[PDB]
Amino acid sequence: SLVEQFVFEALVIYMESLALAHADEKSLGTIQQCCDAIDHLCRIIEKKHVSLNKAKKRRLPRGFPPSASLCLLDLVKWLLAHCGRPQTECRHKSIELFYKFVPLLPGNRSPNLWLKDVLKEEGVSFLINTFEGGGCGQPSGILAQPTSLQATLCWLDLLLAALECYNTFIGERTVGALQVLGTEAQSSLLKAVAFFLESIAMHDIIAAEKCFTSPQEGERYNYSKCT
């Protein structure tokens, strides 16, 4: 009864806990603890899902501020909207698990055609929902170059999350690269290429923003650049 009542809230709560752990310090092992926790969660819900497959009015989680009868598809589209997140490896685990949950839908597996049916409404919103990266979609990265080292790290790992999303999408072979390349006007990759022109392997110390070595402790900046 309680798992029918209280799981999806626990799922979302543990995923922002993991997001917070990514935000503060990814070196600590809390990531693996919550990862195995959500592993237990996904295993138990994939064992028993038909009750969750229907729309049963459950307690509203933190997400989905409108109230409705809780369904599996509800948190499906919830996690779909909750991609493109700065916590790039938290997001990576979330999207891998999501790609595993998509076939768990009763009448639908996860072929490319199902994603195309989903995408039929998302002619161009796909460029922002999955790619909030690139400078808040785009403009922040343009603004990032003039204007703050932590902000540069934020934009950098945002680009990392966006490109990881791209890698996951193309790796599943469920979507072509030309579906986003050329079809819809995206310049995040072009801005990244300009960033490699201006920053990668010569600007290892300065971001050319003129607003900011061990006194700066830019070593984690260097490691993020290498990443």
Curated annotation (Swiss-Prot):
DNA-PK is a heterotrimer of PRKDC and the Ku dimer (composed of XRCC6/Ku70 and XRCC5/Ku86). Formation of this complex may be promoted by interaction with ILF3. Component of the core long-range non-homologous end joining (NHEJ) complex (also named DNA-PK complex) composed of PRKDC, LIG4, XRCC4, XRCC6/Ku70, XRCC5/Ku86 and NHEJ1/XLF. Additional component of the NHEJ complex includes PAXX. Following autophosphorylation, PRKDC dissociates from DNA. Interacts with DNA-PKcs-interacting protein (KIP) with the region upstream the kinase domain. It is linked to Immunodeficiency 26 with or without neurologic abnormalities: A form of severe combined immunodeficiency characterized by reduced or absent T and B cells, recurrent candidiasis, and lower respiratory tract infections. Some patients show dysmorphic features, severe growth failure, microcephaly, seizures, and impaired neurological functions. Disulfide bonds: none annotated. It comes from Homo sapiens. The chain holds residues 1094 to 1336 of 4128 of the full protein. The gene is PRKDC. It is found in: Nucleus; Nucleus, Nucleolus; Cytoplasm, Cytosol. Belongs to the PI3/PI4-kinase family. Autophosphorylated at two clusters, the T2609 cluster and the S2056 cluster. Autophosphorylation induces a conformational change that leads to remodeling of the DNA-PK complex, requisite for efficient end processing and DNA repair. This is DNA-dependent protein kinase catalytic subunit. Serine/threonine-protein kinase that acts as a molecular sensor for DNA damage. Involved in DNA non-homologous end joining (NHEJ) required for double-strand break (DSB) repair and V(D)J recombination. Must be bound to DNA to express its catalytic properties. Promotes processing of hairpin DNA structures in V(D)J recombination by activation of the hairpin endonuclease artemis (DCLRE1C). Recruited by XRCC5 and XRCC6 to DNA ends and is required to (1) protect and align broken ends of DNA, thereby preventing their degradation, (2) and sequester the DSB for repair by NHEJ. The modification N6-acetyllysine is found at residue 116.
